[PDB]
Amino acid sequence: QYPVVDHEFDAVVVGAGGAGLRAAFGLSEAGFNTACVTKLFPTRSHTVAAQGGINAALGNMEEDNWRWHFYDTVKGSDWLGDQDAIHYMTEQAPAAVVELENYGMPFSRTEDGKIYQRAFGGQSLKFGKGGQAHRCCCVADRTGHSLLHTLYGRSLRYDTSYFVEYFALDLLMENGECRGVIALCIEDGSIHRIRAKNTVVATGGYGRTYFSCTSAHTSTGDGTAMITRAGLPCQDLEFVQFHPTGIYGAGCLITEGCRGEGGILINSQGERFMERYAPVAKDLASRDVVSRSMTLEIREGRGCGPEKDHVYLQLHHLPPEQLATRLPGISETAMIFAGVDVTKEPIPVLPTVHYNMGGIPTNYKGQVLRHVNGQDQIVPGLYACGEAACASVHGANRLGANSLLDLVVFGRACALSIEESCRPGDKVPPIKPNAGEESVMNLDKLRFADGSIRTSELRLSMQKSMQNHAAVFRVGSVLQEGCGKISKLYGDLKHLKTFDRGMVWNTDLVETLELQNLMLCALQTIYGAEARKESRGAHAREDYKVRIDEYDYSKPIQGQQKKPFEEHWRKHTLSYVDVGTGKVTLEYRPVIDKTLNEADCATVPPAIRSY
Amino acid sequence: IPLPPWQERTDESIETKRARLLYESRKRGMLENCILLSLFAKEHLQHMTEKQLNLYDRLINEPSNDWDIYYWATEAKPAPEIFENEVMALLRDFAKNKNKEQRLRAPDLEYLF
Ligand SMILES: *Cc1cc2c(cc1C)nc1c(=O)[nH]c(=O)nc-1n2C[C@H](O)[C@H](O)[C@H](O)COP(=O)(O)OP(=O)(O)OC[C@H]1O[C@@H](n2cnc3c(N)ncnc32)[C@H](O)[C@@H]1O
Ligand SMILES: O=C([O-])CC(=O)C(=O)O
Ligand SMILES: [K+]
Numbered sequence A: 001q002y003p004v005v006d007h008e009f010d011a012v013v014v015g016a017g018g019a020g021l022r023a024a025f026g027l028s029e030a031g032f033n034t035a036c037v038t039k040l041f042p043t044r045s046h047t048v049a050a051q052g053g054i055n056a057a058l059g060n061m062e063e064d065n066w067r068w069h070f071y072d073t074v075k076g077s078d079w080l081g082d083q084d085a086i087h088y089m090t091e092q093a094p095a096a097v098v099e100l101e102n103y104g105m106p107f108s109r110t111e112d113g114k115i116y117q118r119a120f121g122g123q124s125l126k127f128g129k130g131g132q133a134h135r136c137c138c139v140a141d142r143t144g145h146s147l148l149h150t151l152y153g154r155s156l157r158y159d160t161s162y163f164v165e166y167f168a169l170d171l172l173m174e175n176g177e178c179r180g181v182i183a184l185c186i187e188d189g190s191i192h193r194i195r196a197k198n199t200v201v202a203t204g205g206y207g208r209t210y211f212s213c214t215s216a217h218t219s220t221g222d223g224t225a226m227i228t229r230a231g232l233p234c235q236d237l238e239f240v241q242f243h244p245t246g247i248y249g250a251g252c253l254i255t256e257g258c259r260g261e262g263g264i265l266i267n268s269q270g271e272r273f274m275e276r277y278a279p280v281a282k283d284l285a286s287r288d289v290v291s292r293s294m295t296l297e298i299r300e301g302r303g304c305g306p307e308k309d310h311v312y313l314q315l316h317h318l319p320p321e322q323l324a325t326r327l328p329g330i331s332e333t334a335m336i337f338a339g340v341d342v343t344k345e346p347i348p349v350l351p352t353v354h355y356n357m358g359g360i361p362t363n364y365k366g367q368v369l370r371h372v373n374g375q376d377q378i379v380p381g382l383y384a385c386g387e388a389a390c391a392s393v394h395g396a397n398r399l400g401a402n403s404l405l406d407l408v409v410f411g412r413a414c415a416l417s418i419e420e421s422c423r424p425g426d427k428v429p430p431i432k433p434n435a436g437e438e439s440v441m442n443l444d445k446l447r448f449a450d451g452s453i454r455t456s457e458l459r460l461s462m463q464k465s466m467q468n469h470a471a472v473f474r475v476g477s478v479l480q481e482g483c484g485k486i487s488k489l490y491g492d493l494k495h496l497k498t499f500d501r502g503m504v505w506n507t508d509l510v511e512t513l514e515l516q517n518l519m520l521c522a523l524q525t526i527y528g529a530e531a532r533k534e535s536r537g538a539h540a541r542e543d544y545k546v547r548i549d550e551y552d553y554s555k556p557i558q559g560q561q562k563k564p565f566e567e568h569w570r571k572h573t574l575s576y577v578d579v580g581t582g583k584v585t586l587e588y589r590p591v592i593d594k595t596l597n598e599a600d601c602a603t604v605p606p607a608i609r610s611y
Numbered sequence B: 001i002p003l004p005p006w007q008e009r010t011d012e013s014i015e016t017k018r019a020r021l022l023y024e025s026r027k028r029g030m031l032e033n034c035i036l037l038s039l040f041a042k043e044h045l046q047h048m049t050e051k052q053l054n055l056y057d058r059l060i061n062e063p064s065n066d067w068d069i070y071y072w073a074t075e076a077k078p079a080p081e082i083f084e085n086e087v088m089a090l091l092r093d094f095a096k097n098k099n100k101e102q103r104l105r106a107p108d109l110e111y112l113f
Helices: A018-029 A066-076 A083-091 A093-103 A143-157 A222-229 A287-300 A320-324 A330-338 A403-421 A437-447 A455-469 A476-495 A507-531 B014-026 B031-047 B050-061 B066-073 B086-095
Strands: A004-008 A011-014 A034-038 A161-164 A166-174 A177-185 A191-195 A198-201 A240-247 A264-266 A311-314 A347-356 A367-372 A375-384 A571-577 A584-590
Touching: A011 A018, A011 A177, A018 A034, A018 A143, A018 A198, A018 A403, A034 A166, A066 A083, A066 A093, A083 A093, A083 A403, A093 A143, A093 A403, A143 A403, A166 A191, A166 A222, A166 A437, A166 A507, A177 A198, A177 A437, A191 A437, A198 A222, A198 A403, A222 A507, A222 A571, A240 A287, A240 A330, A264 A287, A287 A311, A287 A347, A320 A330, A330 A347, A330 B031, A375 A403, A437 A507, A455 A476, A455 A507, A476 A507, A507 A571, A507 A584, A507 B014, B014 B031, B014 B050, B031 B050, B031 B066, B031 B086, B050 B086, B066 B086
Parallel strands: A004 A191, A011 A034, A011 A198, A034 A161, A177 A375, A198 A375
Antiparallel strands: A166 A177, A177 A191, A240 A347, A264 A311, A311 A347, A367 A375, A571 A584
16 A cells, blocks of 8 residues: 655664764765655754854963863763773764864854854863863854754765655564664655665654643654664653753743843742752752752642742843843743743743753764673664764763864764675665555554544653653652553554544644654653663762662772672663563663773762762 | 846746745744744735735745844844835835734635635
């Protein structure tokens, strides 16, 4: 019933974000016949929302060393990040930025023509001894767009074949090797098998598993679900990073500059509660302290609104000139989405999903990993980079301005590893004639569905359950009830009912495919959060408030008995899902503490998390 | 630097044009344009003539930066003369909520069937 168009390329890149465009442009510049599949126009990727900058120890302000950026990233990951990847990312950071500038990115420069660097919170010097660092290189406030505009423009110069508005359905796997991707043409509804010797998955995050995230409705974990349907593991999916101040309901990001310019957080009793939880830093404390404080205020009963589920962000005590000049765009955002005049009303705010540290496990070369009998093994022909991948350079918590760095470094790394292990025009591996039939069968079932639960109704129940069970507040009984609810919602996928039965721009069918991908990401996230009985980075439990490492790093290491692997939690989570039954399976692999070379960069041993 | 000069499509039917512009309105880069354009498409797409659909097509698909479209609709930055038309006026009117509607979540697609 469905004709299948076939395409042959040297390499296929799923995703036209910062990471996908860097990998596609790198493969095409190296001479490979490269296809780039994307359900959006490349400038419509979530990368365009990034208005900050990119971290790099260029030293164009003070004296800086990339090993200090290495130390800050390792410390920020709460020693769950792989130090060999953090070594590769931080060391390649200066060369990548200069390469981006020579590509044509209008980086904001200084008086002497050097790239200007700002001070994003969390950067230090001298291995954390002291001194704020200036590593954030920004292109005004359109760094994310300028990155997408430059890479997509240069990729077209090398004849990168773009499949704009194509929805990748599944990986084409055969005998444990990836031989391309089968995708859906959203315009006409034709199935296309884009065959290639190497596949690079750069599909972004999955923030839409929750009801309140700062990302667009497109971050649906599609690449994460493809890896899951392929029987391959996903890594650290419970580590969901929250931004403290997001508008209640919509989820739009409220910048920390509001609290910097004088904005305060208020509960349902007029109390500036941050004076109590952090008398030193107050409302400008660390994001984890602010988020858990807000969640604790809502739990104990001091929540605002008719449902008492959020707190207030007050700005009206500031003069109107400061609200307009020092905080541009905050008044328009609060009025348009919350119906709030900031000069006389507070902004309803709530902790909001912002970044996914987890995703597809890879090595520092971008090669996707699987776990076979307690050992890591490369999946031939499969690469991942960006927010969809778990290098892991961010470990348990991502630092600011390191995501755009993660995009360009490992997107380039994926291209380098493909061109160093293959050659353009190599023999395109063959696939069975009926390869992808399971994907087309699933697509046809969703199109001809007429059950009892609508797609929007199931999506709302999933997002609500994830918001009420696996968000900032995580405790045993709540997490376990959430696992049962999400598992019940996965069984209810067999009761879906869609309406658009055609194939011409079937947005209803696209969103129902994304709901399938969201449910797979939600199952692995909430089961991994229930199992991880510790507190590390963005994961904080009330029944287990201490970071459980192989040693107790609050005391001298030697003199203690090193806990075995099956007892401590300084280890990555590996999650599988039996798509037929929804059963989740959890494995674990160790954190890579060795660097690329100890002579050039020393391993930073774990230490107690200092807020 | 030069990207494909945006072309006005005249090969698709009016129903295919509305369906395409509905997809391109809901699937944006930022959450701000995701909520506004999806709710603006819910209220105007099925009633627009082909003239208005072609203006709405150019408004939401020609600008490379989604932030530029957002700043024009919120009147934070002056829109170009090629975009100052009737659809931009409706978008500015829709952005300045007068009936005090939701503007929180993207509308569910159950209003089309
Ligand atoms: C959400 C967000 C993130 C963000 C930020 C502000 C916001 C609102 N500001 C940042 C900042 O100032 N500095 C920084 O370092 N990071 C900042 N971030 C985070 C970071 O920028 C993002 O995580 C990053 O841009 C994500 O990059 P990535 O390329 O991995 O993800 P993407 O840009 O969303 O691209 C995904 C692409 O994949 C395509 N896709 C997805 N699913 C499919 C399917 N099924 N088929 C085909 N293509 C698919 C998308 O179309 C897109 O092109
Ligand atoms: O400034 C913000 O709110 C966004 C942010 O921390 C980042 O993504 O780097
Ligand atoms: K990630």
